[PDB]
Amino acid sequence: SLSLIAAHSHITGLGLDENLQPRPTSEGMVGQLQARRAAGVILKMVQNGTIAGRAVLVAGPPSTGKTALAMGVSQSLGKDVPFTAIAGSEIFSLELSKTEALTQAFRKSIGIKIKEETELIEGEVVEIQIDRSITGGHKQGKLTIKTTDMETIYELGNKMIDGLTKEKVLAGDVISIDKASGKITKLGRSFARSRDYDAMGADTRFVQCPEGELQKRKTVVHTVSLHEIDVINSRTQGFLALFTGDTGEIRSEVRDQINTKVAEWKEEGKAEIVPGVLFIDEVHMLDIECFSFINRALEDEFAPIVMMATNRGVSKTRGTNYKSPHGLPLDLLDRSIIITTKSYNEQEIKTILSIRAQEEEVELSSDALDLLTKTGVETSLRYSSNLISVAQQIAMKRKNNTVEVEDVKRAYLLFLDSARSVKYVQENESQYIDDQGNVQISIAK
Amino acid sequence: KSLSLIAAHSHITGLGLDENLQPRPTSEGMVGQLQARRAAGVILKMVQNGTIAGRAVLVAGPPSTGKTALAMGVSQSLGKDVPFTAIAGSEIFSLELSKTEALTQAFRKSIGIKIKEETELIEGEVVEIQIDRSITGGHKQGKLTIKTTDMETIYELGNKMIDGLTKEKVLAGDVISIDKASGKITKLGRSFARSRFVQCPEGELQKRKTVVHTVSLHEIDVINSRTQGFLALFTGDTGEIRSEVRDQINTKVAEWKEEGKAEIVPGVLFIDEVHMLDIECFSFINRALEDEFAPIVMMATNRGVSKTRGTNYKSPHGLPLDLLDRSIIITTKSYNEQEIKTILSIRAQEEEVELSSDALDLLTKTGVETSLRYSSNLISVAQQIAMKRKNNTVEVEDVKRAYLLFLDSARSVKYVQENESQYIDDQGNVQISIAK
Amino acid sequence: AKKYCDVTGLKGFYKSPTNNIRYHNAEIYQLIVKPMAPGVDQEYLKLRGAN
Amino acid sequence: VTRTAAHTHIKGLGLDESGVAKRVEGGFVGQIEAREACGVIVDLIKAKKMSGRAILLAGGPSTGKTALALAISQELGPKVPFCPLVGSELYSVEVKKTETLMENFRRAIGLRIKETKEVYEGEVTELTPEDAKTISHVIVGLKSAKGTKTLRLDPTIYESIQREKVSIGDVIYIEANTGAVKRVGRSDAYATEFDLETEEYVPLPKGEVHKKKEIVQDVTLHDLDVANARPQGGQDVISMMGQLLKPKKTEITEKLRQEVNKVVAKYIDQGVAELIPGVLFIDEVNMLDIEIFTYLNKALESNIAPVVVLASNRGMTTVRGTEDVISPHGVPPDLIDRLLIVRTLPYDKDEIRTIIERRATVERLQVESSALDLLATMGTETSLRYALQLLAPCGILAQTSNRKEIVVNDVNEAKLLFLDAKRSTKILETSANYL
Amino acid sequence: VTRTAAHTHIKGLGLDESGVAKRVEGGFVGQIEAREACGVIVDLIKAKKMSGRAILLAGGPSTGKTALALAISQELGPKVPFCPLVGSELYSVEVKKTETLMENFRRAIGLRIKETKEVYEGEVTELTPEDAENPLGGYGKTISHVIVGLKSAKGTKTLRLDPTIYESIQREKVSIGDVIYIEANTGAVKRVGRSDAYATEFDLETEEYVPLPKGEVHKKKEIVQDVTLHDLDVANARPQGGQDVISMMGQLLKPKKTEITEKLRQEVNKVVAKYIDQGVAELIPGVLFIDEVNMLDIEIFTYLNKALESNIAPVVVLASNRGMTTVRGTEDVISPHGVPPDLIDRLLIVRTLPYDKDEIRTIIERRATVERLQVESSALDLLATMGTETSLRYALQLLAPCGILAQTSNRKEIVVNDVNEAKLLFLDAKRSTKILETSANYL
Ligand SMILES: Nc1ncnc2c1ncn2[C@@H]1O[C@H](COP(=O)(O)OP(=O)(O)O)[C@@H](O)[C@H]1O
Ligand SMILES: Nc1ncnc2c1ncn2[C@@H]1O[C@H](COP(=O)(O)OP(=O)(O)O)[C@@H](O)[C@H]1O
Ligand SMILES: Nc1ncnc2c1ncn2[C@@H]1O[C@H](COP(=O)(O)OP(=O)(O)O)[C@@H](O)[C@H]1O
Ligand SMILES: Nc1ncnc2c1ncn2[C@@H]1O[C@H](COP(=O)(O)OP(=O)(O)O)[C@@H](O)[C@H]1O
């Protein structure tokens, strides 16, 4: 929960009914009824989990709500479903190929669900004794574990003994031992022994002594993506590559082995497959090789549902020398269904600006909101959305709690949009460095 | 100290200037370019004052007319314990470093940190060494009789000093230097005794001397970086030192400067042939000259309205106009016959080549008619013709023999243009057959 | 115990090997410690009882 | 004494309590509207509520965009993080440019940690271990000039002490919270056990044995990301040599960033840590690639993205990485929808003269009144930066002739010796052989 | 009998004591002025007083530029370091071309070092380690010392060894009865082999049986070494040779080319200057030869412009066969020989002239003499006319198929019919090009 007020933090799910019918303004989403209904259909396709490898293109003009629709789909999906939102330029790597980055993004968006039982015995040890036998081949021990309420004695096997010799226990530190799994961890020393040793050290930490029942039962559900299994089985200590990203072109034989073992676990009942969405924001910034691999990797059984967003017209495909619709080749557009987003009118711009003002805790007047709506009709919507939050700071600088028309006018004067800046550049083109590198620095001749 | 015999700029011992920053016509191996030498003396005083940072200096002119000579004069008149990084334009195109990172390392190699510290040293001639050992060698007794020319003393040595004396074997008559703290014992050699050789030290034995260190900011950057140790100053695999280490080093240097623990010694970064950089490097130079710990950057170029690298347009000196906005430009001029004759006389007396008057006049004529560097290179290659016929002084016909043996640019271009079929053109067409 | 110069009572860094007398610096050694009469050293050392 | 490098007369935006810019305040001359806009931006940063707020300030070269960015960084103080960046720095040969952009994004989000420094120091007069071959507790009695102090110790500190070969009489350093052990050296009481000895001897510290201190740890999110994603492994506190395998930058995954954000939020909810969002300032943005420009669109919509400030001196220029996308300031239109543009105006003769006088005052130079208008005329005729950079040769040519005043002859001499870009290009055009 | 490959018929420039070239001496035919210029350059290198003197060999294909450079290398001798190079060899995928050029610059400067070595050698008689009181203390080695008994011819010795010396003792698998060689300079230990005083025929390892080393066990021997500055640079950059941890791990890692810093090169120059100052080292500058110099791009050309003004740079010899060709990496500049004019201004161009018919004929005759093939006068005249008609190299490389065709007919001489059949079997560039124009499918 380290979130400030983002670009679209007001959107909590698509505002749909039980019949996949969009409400006009609910769950932070205003308008775009056909796009929201199609996004609800795609969300039901994801939640069904039986259709795999479908490509969806969310196409429209800039500042319309394509990535807003993707954020709504991600928020309406809920937790424990793998959603991977990447930009189009994230796959041009130096340590990975474009195909390897593509398939790593593909396998990050489909996962398995594992349910396991934990019989946790978490407590502070009272005393542990080492029974060094004369033979030395076998060691037995009695573990005096305690909480703030009860204290029990546990007989201890030899594997417990040399697993507690490692991560060594010093009679008063909080540990937690599983019964069936046999996992050991050392959470740290108790707060009762905080003033015992006069200096902490490096590898120690102070934790509270646990309370209540000593032996606790908890079912914990793990959602593991296929990319996690790939990175783990790609090496001997693979989690360092999982958190540093130094996987380095995992070979396809371990991917086929992992797919076979995942199908074996699904048929056996050890885990169940949880598919998700891979959202490639700004998909027009991809090479034609990445496009062909996207076409031919969507036909795999373990493929997620790919949502693509673009705002390009009939633009040039990257890596080629011809133009194409949406910046995508026609074979990729053949295997896709296009959701189109329409431009807004005055009422929808007013409602979006009001919702964005409420999300930023900014209070506006009625005529100030009318001026902001007129600015968002003439200029773009994002310009007025930023003008709201800078007119708020003007209002607090003026010792006022509400944003009036004068604050919006001052913010309009201070901060320029695209059209005013391009007109002011074209009027004084000699003062700027042009494409030929010529500029007039001096103000007089 | 650090000897190398003859170089191209070895005759230059600095800018020849008086106390009033006016250039003598012939001083310190530098003749001509009086306005350029005066401007370079002004830049040298800008460096020597040390109160002004991040100034771009551009040295522009025709090729082979006093550009790198001016930088070598600035570096020679700068004096030691002041950093002078001399890099080229093509030196920053690394395979394990970015261009901005290599430029940052070249910038920070030219700012020195002046630190004075006191140390204790014991230096003298060993008279007698007496270690008594046991069977196991755990406990040992020692007696070190050491002397200088003024003193004699005897020391009882602990076990660690006995171990450090048996290691790096010291005998009687050796002259050694001992650091009491680190325990390093350096054998300076043997004393003057017939029955390599170093004079016996004089005066005190336990000496307190002040050593003076000048460590560049790049060295502290490498050492403070926890990924690689100090050996990356020699191996060169520093590998993109992060900016937080740079900020910590800047704050610690600003801390040491206020408490008097250290001094700032700014230097000169000389980027020879600066036209080889791209527009990204030029903009990083533009934003890297507005920093506190930035040296005074001297750039040299001979390009005139050339294409900027990484762009598609033409710019003066190969540099964009925003970089030229931040630079003050020193212009070097071409030489007349007397300046060329004086340069040839200096280069001949540098290489120990005795010239006649007629050979000097011929060299001056072919210098003002072909190139200065051609006549500079003809001297050393005509001296071998002079000693090949057992003659000391280089005569006129030795210079004529070297002229007909070795071609300049114009004669080679004319010979290529007359025989264009014998050479490979742009289209890869050649004729090897001498018939037809 | 701290070692002091036998001539002046200063901090005695060195000690002459012939007459076994600790001294402070080079000037003291050249002036007093080296050109001294026999028997003077045995009563210099009598102060700290090292005779 | 002091070093001035094209700045350091800029002490701030020079505004009043109402956010109105005076004509001359804080070393700023003119530029009222952009200074007021930057003050509004500074208030928005100090509100610490919004994320991903991007502004771009554009204008002609030598008009004060970097001066305004440094004034913003001065007005925010040294507590708020500020990451100055050039657009060429994002192109790294070790890692991709989007990872470098994300690293510079997370370098501009800081944390404030209230931590306690506790130090035990002094001569060791008692070092007695207690076993049960396993040491149970360690009794250490330190000694300083103000008295002694006897401490228990866990066996880990004896492991560090035996690493440091600490014996009786060695003046050592012990940090209570972190367990760092440093051996300063032996004391002067044991400096006469041998006449010559390899050990170094430090005096008894005159302070107390137990010293307590409250200090403030200012870290960033990128520092925690680097410290949690070392590819080879951790290193000790004292290590003069690097690891034998070269550690290069790696594409840090989103999982590590999510876990770091979770741990930082958990420490914030306990009140231990305070989140200070800051400014990422990318200068000369017009040479960003279209890949970096496209990834900036996604990175600006993050929940923890800082306030991004861009500067460009281009007009109708092609975006780098494209071939026909003509866009204002070299910035693509889909990004330019996401920022607010602050126009930076050129100066007139009086403002140029006032800037010249301010820079001459901050460089400790006395300029005559007649030379100042000539320098202003040269600034209006060639460039402001040419007139600003000629003050130092003018001062040295004045000091050469034993004076503390800039006479008009010295300005004429400095104009004759050093040339601007216009006269250099005039020489370049009217010459035959490479200049 | 021997192996000859396009060369080795040239043993030198073929000059007298006055520097005047003869016509046919040293396997060289013609090129009097070029050979005299190369002899003057050879005298300049032998003067050992210059730095950065760069010449350029200009001429057409098959005119003798690489032959002249190899003749310079043969005339200077094996003591002068010669570094032949190709312009495309500077493009490396491990390090930048700047570093490769500077490495080849440092590889051409060598020096003769008179190095003294402290040597403990002999037959191992005893090997008794001394254990420590606490081996599991965490810090400190397991053993304290190792007593080594060494016996040589007329003398014996016992040595109490440091554990770090014992690591290098054990790593070469030293046992009792082995002749060893301990070098005290680096701590390196060489196991010479099993001693021959005991039995020999009872081993299963093909070991070397070595007699007792003469003289004392402890020795000081002076060894004359020949190293270059680049060898010292890569020794200090990748440190192997010590007994410390970094030296042992330096031998096991994959060797990679690194950017050698200017600080390391200046420190190496300072130590080498000190070694010269004591008189145990003598500096021998050499030749760096970069054949096909037209294939350098403008970056390496600009760094060559910078590095020719260094005070330690060797004598550089360049060769090209381009007339007016654009420099690689650039678009518009037309320059002679593919070399930019800023580098041309620091050069001394030596022109190499083409050959006549008689020079081609005696070149064919001398190459047939070196290849040990007998040719008659009519076949030699046919080969001369053939060489003037097509090229010199095509007549040069048709000598061996002519000898093969003569050997298949059980004859020793080469006749007109052998040259005719080698002409019919094998084609030159011009006839194959004429085949290429007159074809429908692309040939
Ligand atoms: N239907 C909508 N409901 C609520 N907010 C919207 C809607 N459409 C767009 N927005 C808001 O407009 C801003 C910019 O729209 P965005 O989704 O970035 O456009 P695009 O998808 O073309 O990039 C976002 O912050 C988003 O929250
Ligand atoms: N004023 C001078 N005094 C002595 N030598 C000079 C002078 N000017 C130029 N030279 C000589 O001219 C040669 C070319 O140097 P320079 O012109 O400074 O570099 P560049 O050729 O890169 O412009 C040098 O070898 C130098 O010896
Ligand atoms: N209003 C001002 N007051 C004082 N100095 C200024 C003012 N505006 C600009 N300057 C100076 O002019 C120079 C402009 O350079 P800079 O801001 O780095 O480039 P740009 O203006 O192109 O962004 C700075 O060194 C700054 O010190
Ligand atoms: N003057 C000469 N005398 C004898 N043989 C020569 C002479 N010139 C060239 N050759 C031979 O002709 C061949 C020419 O090849 P080479 O010299 O390598 O090419 P280039 O002439 O382009 O440098 C060489 O094998 C050499 O043996």
- Counting one residue from D and one from E, how many pairs have CB atoms under 8 Å apart? 12
CA-closest candidate to residue E117, choices E226, E189, E242, E220: E220
Listed in order, strand segments (DSSP E) in B290-395 are 296-301, 306-307, 314-315, 327-331
Residue D192 touches chain C, beta carbons under 8 Å? yes
- In contact, D425 and B331? CB cutoff 8 Å: no
A25, amino acid identity: T
Q: Which residues pair with B319 in a beta bridge?
A: none
Half-sphere exposure of E352 (CA within 13 A, CB side): 26
CA distance linking residue A436 with residue B314, whole number of Å: 8
CA-closest candidate to residue B173, choices B125, B124, B123: B125
Cβ distance D192 to C15 less than 8 Å, yes or no, reads no
Q: What number does the ligand 2 atom closest to the CA of B67 have?
A: 18
Distance of CA E243 to the CA centre of its chain: 30
Cβ distance D195 to C1 less than 8 Å, yes or no, reads no
Residue D232 touches chain E, beta carbons under 8 Å? no
Q: How far, in Å, is the centroid of ligand 3 from the Cα of A144?
A: 72
Q: Coil, strand or helix: which one is B334?
A: coil
Q: Nearest ligand, CA of residue D23? A: 3
Residue A443 touches chain B, beta carbons under 8 Å? no
Listed in order, strand segments (DSSP E) in A191-345 are 206-207, 215-225, 272-275, 277-281, 305-310, 314-316, 323-325, 337-340
The total of other beta-carbon atoms located within 10 Å of residue B167's CB is: 10
Residue B100 touches chain D, beta carbons under 8 Å? yes
Angle at which helices D391-400 and B34-49 pack, to 10 degrees?
100
Mutation for testing the A interface, residue in B313, B319, B324 having most A CBs under 10 Å: B313
CA angle E141, E142, E145 (to 5 degrees): 80
CA distance linking residue A92 with residue A100, whole number of Å: 10
DSSP A327: T
Q: Which residues pair with D212 in a beta bridge?
A: D118
Residues of B in contact with D419 (CB under 8 A): 328-331
The total of other beta-carbon atoms located within 10 Å of residue B178's CB is: 25
CA distance linking residue E407 with residue B309, whole number of Å: 61
CA distance linking residue E305 with residue B91, whole number of Å: 12
Report which secondary-structure segment, H or E, holds E434: helix E429-437
- In contact, A281 and A70? CB cutoff 8 Å: yes
What the block records as the tokens of A129 is: 């004794």
CA distance linking residue B299 with residue B281, whole number of Å: 13
The total of other beta-carbon atoms located within 10 Å of residue B302's CB is: 23
What the block records as the tokens of D71 is: 């004034």
Q: Which residues pair with D279 in a beta bridge?
A: D82, D307
CA distance linking residue D54 with residue D300, whole number of Å: 8
Residue D196 touches chain C, beta carbons under 8 Å? no
- Determine which residue's CA is closest to atom 1 belonging to ligand 1: A30
Closest Cα in chain A, distance from residue D132 (Å): 11
CA distance linking residue B341 with residue A247, whole number of Å: 67
Q: Report the binding-site residues of D for ATP.
A: 59-66
- In contact, B339 and B311? CB cutoff 8 Å: no
Residues of E in contact with D162 (CB under 8 A): 137-139
CA dihedral (D20, D26, D31, D36) positive or negative: negative
Among D62, D353, D384, which residue has the most ligand 3 atoms within 8 Å of its CB, making it the best to mutate? D62
Residue B312 touches chain E, beta carbons under 8 Å? no
Is E17 buried (19+), middle (13-18) or exposed (0-12) by CB count in 10 A?
exposed
Cα R_g (chain B), whole angstroms: 29
Q: Which residues pair with E94 in a beta bridge?
A: none
Tell me the C-alpha to C-alpha distance, in Å, between residue A307 and each of A281, A375, A414, D293, D299: 8, 32, 39, 21, 18
Q: Coil, strand or helix: which one is A131?
A: coil
Q: How far, in Å, is the centroid of ligand 2 from the Cα of B69?
A: 5
CA-closest candidate to residue A363, choices A421, A319, A407: A407
Q: Are strands D54-59 and D307-312 parallel, antiparallel or unpaired?
A: parallel
CA angle A156, A160, A163 (to 5 degrees): 155
The total of other beta-carbon atoms located within 10 Å of residue D325's CB is: 17
Closest Cα in chain A, distance from residue D209 (Å): 13
Q: Coil, strand or helix: which one is B59?
A: strand
Q: Coil, strand or helix: which one is C13?
A: coil
Method used to solve the structure: cryo-EM
**Phi-psi category of residue E14: left, alpha or beta, with phi > 0 → left and psi -120 to 50 → alpha:** left
What the block records as the tokens of A263 is: 């199908």
- The 3-state secondary structure of chain D, one letter per residue: CCCECCCCCCCCCCECCCCCECCEECCEECCHHHHHHHHHHHHHHHHCCECCCEEEEEECCCCCHHHHHHHHHHHHCCCCCEEEEEHHHHCCCCCCHHHHHHHHHHCCEEEEEEEEEEEEEEEEEEEEEEECCCEEEEEEEEEECCEEEEEEECHHHHHHHHHCCCCCCEEEEEECCCCCEEEEEECHHHCCCCCECCCCECCCCCCCCEEEEEEEEEEEHHHHHHHHCCCCCCCCCCCCCCCCCCCCCCCCCHHHHHHHHHHHHHHHHCCCEEEEECEEEEECHHHCCHHHHHHHHHHCCCCCCCEEEEEECECEEECCCCCCCEEECCCCHHHHCCEEEEEECCCCHHHHHHHHHHHHHHCCCCECHHHHHHHHHHHHHCCHHHHHHCHHHHHHHHHHCCCCCECHHHHHHHHHHCECHHHHHHHHHCCCCCC
Tell whether ligand 4 has an atom less than 6 A from the beta carbon of residue E29: yes
CA-closest candidate to residue E123, choices E150, E101, E83: E150
CA dihedral (A259, A260, A262, A266) positive or negative: positive
The total of other beta-carbon atoms located within 10 Å of residue B382's CB is: 25
- In contact, B46 and D400? CB cutoff 8 Å: no
What the block records as the tokens of E89 is: 């060899």
Tell me the C-alpha to C-alpha distance, in Å, between residue A50 and each of A45, A54, A81, A275: 8, 11, 14, 9
Mutation for testing the A interface, residue in B317, B322, B324, B326 having most A CBs under 10 Å: B322
Q: Residue D167 phi/psi, 5° resolution?
A: -115, -175
* Ligand 3: lining residues by beta carbon, under 6 Å: B 290; D 6-7, 27-31, 61-67, 311, 313, 355, 358, 384
Nearest chain D residue to A425, by CA: D315
- Determine which residue's CA is closest to atom 9 belonging to ligand 1: A65
CA-closest candidate to residue D85, choices D115, D56, D67, D105: D105
- The 3-state secondary structure of E253-288, one letter per residue: CCCCCCCCCHHHHHHHHHHHHHHHHHCCEEEEECEE
What the block records as the tokens of E327 is: 């420099």
- In contact, A234 and A253? CB cutoff 8 Å: no
CA distance linking residue C1 with residue C9, whole number of Å: 14
Residue C26 touches chain D, beta carbons under 8 Å? no
Tell whether ligand 1 has an atom less than 6 A from the beta carbon of residue A147: no
Residue A351 CB contacts under 8 Å (≥ 6 apart), including other chains: A25, A30, A31
Compute the residue count for chain C.
51
Angle at which helices B337-350 and B372-388 pack, to 10 degrees?
40
Q: Which residues pair with E210 in a beta bridge?
A: E195
Nearest chain A residue to D45, by CA: A393
Q: What number does the ligand 3 atom closest to the CA of D7 have?
A: 27
CA distance linking residue E165 with residue E180, whole number of Å: 13
- In contact, A79 and A360? CB cutoff 8 Å: no
Among A63, A380, A381, which residue has the most ligand 1 atoms within 8 Å of its CB, making it the best to mutate? A63
CA distance linking residue E375 with residue E387, whole number of Å: 15
**Given the structure tokens 């876990």, which residue do they identify?**
D259
Q: What number does the ligand 2 atom closest to the CA of B70 have?
A: 18
* Ligand 2: lining residues by beta carbon, under 6 Å: B 8-9, 29-33, 63-69, 302, 343, 346, 372-373
**Given the structure tokens 């080795």, which residue do they identify?**
E8
- In contact, D36 and D57? CB cutoff 8 Å: no
CA distance linking residue E306 with residue E301, whole number of Å: 9
Mutation for testing the B interface, residue in A430, A431, A434, A441 having most B CBs under 10 Å: A441
CA distance linking residue A170 with residue A167, whole number of Å: 10
Nearest chain D residue to B291, by CA: D5
Q: How far, in Å, is the centroid of ligand 4 from the Cα of E62?
A: 6
